[PDB]
């Protein structure tokens with residue numbers, strides 16, 4: 176069929192990311208216009224999951240990826256408010272399904288945040304941007320990480336304190352910060368350091384302060400298990416799936 180290979184760039188989505196529409200079929204795709212690029216394409220070619228942004232191919236580098244019409248999770252969070260608890264729980268279930276998948280194939284995202292969490296037409300959460308992602312398990316052998324990656328309010332404390340650390344508890348921590356943002360509409364600290372008063376207040380269990388005062392006791396008990404400073408004592412995803420609020424039936 177002629178012209179099915181022609182795509183029209185209609186608007187900027189956020190190098191740059193552009194919404195491209197097929198001339199013939201009117202199918203929409205997101206086009207990412209860019210050592211690190213080669214790894215991103217290689218990691219993207221491994222991915223196939225319902226809660227991970229689809230990769231269609233590559234061809235200046237033009238990465239062709241899934242268009243998510245619901246936009247960013249970031250824009251569903253009302254500043255200092257958050258969102259209804261049942262929406263946050265459903266998005267958190269979908270985030271865990273995505274993270275379990277990635278960890279299962281030995282990939283760590285390393286920059287989980289609401290800007291990188293996209294929503295399709297049915298508001299299904301999709302993990303996006305594997306530009307900072309790396310392989311932490313190969314030939315069933317785990318590789319400890321040492322590189323500084325991520326966004327300070329979402330990074331786990333071990334990344335700032337230790338020379339080497341396990342990949343999986345780092346992504347679990349960033350997921351607990353995303354959960355905090357969804358339920359309170361605010362980030363708890365600039366970074367997880369003892370010099371940070373908000374971080375020190377949390378370790379001292381001062382949950383009568385913001386953002387914790389806005390969060391119900393059942394999701395707050397989950398956050399007490401995720402935002403644990405020692406990554407060896409931090410709750411794992413199999414145990415998050417057993418948490419009481421995680422399995423609480425909720426409706427608006």
Ligand SMILES: COc1cc2c(cc1OCCCN1CCOCC1)Cc1c(-c3ccc(C#N)cc3)n[nH]c1-2
Pocket residue numbers: 188189192205207228240241242243244245246247250293303304305306
């Ligand atoms: C439907 O709207 C959007 C769709 C998408 C994005 C942003 C979108 O929203 C633009 C932000 C507009 N906001 C309005 C209110 O507040 C200011 C910003 C970004 C994006 C992507 C995407 C796919 C893959 C990657 C990678 N790597 C990066 C981005 N796929 N689909 C979309």
